[PDB]
Amino acid sequence: EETRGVLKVFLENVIRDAVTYTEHAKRKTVTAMDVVYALKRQGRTLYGFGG
DNA sequence: GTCCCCCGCGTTTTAACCGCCAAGGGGATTACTCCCTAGTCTCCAGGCACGTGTCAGATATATACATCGATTAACGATGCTGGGCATA
């Protein structure tokens, strides 16, 4: 139960940013890159995606 | 040394996944023009360093006033003690 709790905490912040990059460009479709940078900002960047 | 909260396991219940097809929002491309920027000149007044200046606090400092602490000179009353005078 706690563990999901934290998942929730991690999940928001990312989307927070995601949303921001989607919106600084005036775009309706949220890019996956958009997620990457987000992860990059917290230092959890994902290889495999979106060079 | 004790107790009860997880794992293993069989069966019961829900919804993830795959396949298929639809439809339109939104992202991607393109063309044109026009505002906004880098680049370039002149100028200084903004900014940097520093001498000069009277005002916050802080520190005594000469001068004066009020209050004792303690000491010393002066005054009231002797106490035996010493130096002599009338009686056994």
Q: Would you state the structure tokens that stand for residue A23, as one six-digit string?
A: 């919106």
CA of A39 to C1' of B31 (A): 38
Our count of domains for chain A comes to 1
Q: Which of A1, A3, A5, A50 is nearest to A38 (CA)?
A: A50
- Output phi, psi for A18, to 5 deg: -55, -50
Q: Shortest CA–C1' contact from A29: which nucleotide?
A: B26
Q: Shortest CA–C1' contact from A25: which nucleotide?
A: B27
**Distances from the Cα of A48 to the Cα of A9, A14, A23, A33, angstroms:** 25, 18, 25, 11
- Residue A4 belongs to domain with CATH number: 1.10.20.10
Distance of CA A38 to the CA centre of its chain: 4
| Method underlying the structure | cryo-EM
Nucleotides of B under 7 A from a protein CB: 25-27
List, in sequence order, the alpha helices (H) in chain A: 2-24, 32-42
Q: Classify residue A50 as left (phi > 0), alpha (psi -120 to 50) or beta.
A: left
Domain of residue A6 covers: 1-51
- For residue A46, the SS3 value is coil
In the block, residue with structure tokens 């905490």 = A9
CA of A51 to C1' of B39 (A): 35
